[PDB]
């Protein structure tokens, strides 16, 4: 099982600030990760995986920090052997919980990298484009 055979959650990963989709350039599901209009293509169907990786329905690829400091986040091959490294694993931090116009309860949280202990982040407090990691500072744009 190279796939995520035990997903916690599957759907569009939206930013709490902008309500915009976390997106991979193109429709292949590989490339740079940045926000964008929700276009309903399978590359925007994000898999929150039980093993702690973040993937997508278009391609068996992992949300990967492009370095060791405050680096850009790309969608690239999952290192799966000998085991998934901590750099490609993520976790829920603090959680804001709200009800959208659909009348459905949503739960936005910080997405914290397990190697650097840093936060999934968009540039500034509302760019609204390029995504990477950063220090966790409770702004409503570090919530997804």
């Amino acid at each position: 099982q190279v796939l995520c055979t035990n997903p916690l959650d599957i759907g569009e990963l939206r930013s709490f600030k902008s309500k915009q989709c976390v997106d991979i350039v193109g429709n292949q599901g590989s490339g740079n990760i940045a926000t964008y209009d929700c276009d309903g293509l399978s590359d925007q169907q994000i898999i929150i995986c039980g093993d702690g990786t973040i993937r997508n329905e278009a391609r068996n690829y992992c949300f990967t920090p492009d370095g060791s400091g405050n680096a850009n986040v790309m969608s690239s091959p999952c290192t799966l052997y000998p085991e998934i490294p901590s750099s490609q694993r993520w976790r829920q931090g603090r959680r804001k919980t709200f009800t959208d116009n659909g009348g459905i309860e949503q739960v936005a949280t910080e997405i914290i990298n397990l190697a650097s202990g840093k936060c999934l982040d968009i540039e500034g407090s509302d760019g609204t484009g390029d995504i990477g990691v950063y220090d966790c500072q409770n702004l409503d744009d570090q919530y997804f």
């Binding site: 190279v2 068996n60 690829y61 999952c78 799966l80």
Partner: protein, 144 residues
């Protein structure tokens, strides 16, 4: 010494998960380049996989080998010179059902087909966890 390979783990053809093409050798001598091609019921497309990691072609009696010694480059059939670049493991981590990746012992790189569509030439590449790098052992006499 009489060189032992250990058992005999598999004897069959290798059908590609992405394209359902068979791991093939050019011509029918069992010698030369290895590429993806239509499943033909010839002995040149049957391989024996041993405990020692060698994949031996049933027609030619020679090894599935990578160019040079690094374990990176084009794949073909070549003399079995007990080197680690002619040895492959089948890590359960990169399987999807009965379709599995072959990991080169010398370079930790996967047996791979060029492009994403599992139709071109066969070499080694970074294990990316994609269908075109996964092969099923098949025992039928099917042709296209």
């Amino acid at each position: 010494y009489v060189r032992s390979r250990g058992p005999e783990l598999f004897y069959g053809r290798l059908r590609n998960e992405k394209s359902d093409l068979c791991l093939d050798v050019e011509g029918s001598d069992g010698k030369g380049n290895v590429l993806m091609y239509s499943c033909e019921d010839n002995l040149d497309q049957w391989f024996r996989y041993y405990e020692n990691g060698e994949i031996v072609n049933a027609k030619s009696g020679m090894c599935l080998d990578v160019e040079g010694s690094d374990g990176s480059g084009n794949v073909g059939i070549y003399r079995c010179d007990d080197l680690r670049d002619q040895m492959w493991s089948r890590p359960n981590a990169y399987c999807n059902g009965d379709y599995c990746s072959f990991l080169n012992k010398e370079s930790n790189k996967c047996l791979d087909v060029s492009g994403d569509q599992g139709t071109g030439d066969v070499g080694t590449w970074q294990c990316d966890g994609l269908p075109d790098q996964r092969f099923k052992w098949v025992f039928d006499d099917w042709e296209v």
